Design a protein around this ligand. Structure first.
Ligand SMILES: *CCC(=O)Nc1cc(C(=O)NCc2cn(-c3ccccc3C)nn2)cc(-c2n[nH]c3ccccc23)c1
Length: 283
């Protein structure tokens, strides 16, 4: 069913002219910031043009399929509803602060471990939920697909190439050189964790896509430095994700029993405040 917006448990009959367009947002991968006139809620709306590129439209619809059946996962962005007009489909998603990539840009430096700990719990539980509940592999884990909001929430973004290929920079060794699969996302999570923890992308000074792949296979996994005060548990987690033999790489169920995960499940970390203060610094 479409033509309904449900926010916080309250469903409102709606059409797209009940929404005020407040402007484009930061994803070319079209999304608008819109305001529900009936309630004042500000939401994100994807506009899928009927006459659009069917390669991209297929991707919007696969992303929407897993989003829609994933409403009981608190670590995946939710869809408030849809509007199917004669010319367009509008997908109303919850509005969040930014992607972890832009956080790294605005921060101009490392993200603290206590924020990465809550993030690591969220993405792992999101990917584990996708595998067990829906048999879905993300295959494109990267900081641009990790979202954060004013209220300390961290959620998996949008997965339009999910299967029941990704960016070459975060691709696992066994996807570069498959000997002949769910552990390929664990590697990209580790590369993203090292990137956000150091403020640098691990494989540095790479000019072409193929050169990045070359250093993934030719060189040792990029682990966390020991002179930044990282906890032993954090380093143990990163080295476990960034294991090069995919058979010796842990599954999600073994990953969730890791001390790093177990600590930040029960440690109250104020992500909301840290997020608002970092977002305050202008450019
Ligand atoms: C970088 C990757 C990404 O997905 N980025 C992204 C950015 C934003 C975003 O920048 N939103 C701006 C914004 C402004 N407010 C705001 C402004 C003034 C006063 C009050 C408020 C609340 N809020 N947000 C948003 C998104 C985004 N939001 N929801 C979704 C859902 C699915 C994908 C992306 C997404 C993402």
């Amino acid at each position: 069913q479409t033509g309904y917006l449900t926010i916080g448990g309250q469903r409102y009959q709606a059409e797209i002219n009940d929404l005020e367009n407040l402007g484009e947002m930061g994803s070319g991968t079209q999304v608008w910031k819109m305001r529900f006139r009936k309630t004042g809620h500000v939401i994100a709306v994807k506009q899928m043009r009927r006459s659009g590129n069917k390669e991209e439209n297929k991707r919007i619809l696969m992303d929407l399929d897993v989003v829609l059946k994933s409403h009981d996962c608190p670590y995946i962005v939710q869809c408030f509803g849809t509007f199917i007009t004669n010319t367009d489909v509008f997908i109303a998603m919850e509005l969040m602060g930014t992607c972890a990539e832009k956080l790294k840009k605005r921060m101009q430096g490392p993200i603290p471990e206590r924020i990465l700990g809550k993030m690591t719990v969220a993405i792992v539980k999101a990917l584990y939920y996708l595998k067990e509940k829906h048999g879905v592999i993300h295959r494109d884990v990267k900081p641009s697909n990790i979202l954060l909001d004013e209220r300390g929430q961290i959620k998996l973004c949008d997965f339009g190439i999910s299967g029941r290929a990704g960016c070459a920079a975060y691709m696992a060794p066994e996807r570069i050189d498959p000997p002949d699969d769910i552990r390929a996302d664990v590697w990209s999570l580790g590369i993203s964790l090292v990137e956000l923890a150091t403020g640098q992308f691990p494989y540095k000074n790479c000019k072409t896509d193929f050169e990045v792949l070359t250093k993934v296979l030719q060189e040792e996994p990029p682990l966390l430095p020991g002179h930044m005060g990282f906890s032993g548990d954090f380093q143990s987690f990163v080295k476990d994700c960034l294991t090069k033999d995919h058979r010796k790489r842990p599954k999600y169920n073994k990953l969730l029993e890791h001390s790093f995960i177990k600590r930040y499940e029960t440690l109250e970390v104020d992500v909301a405040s840290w997020f608002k203060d970092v977002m305050a610094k202008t450019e």
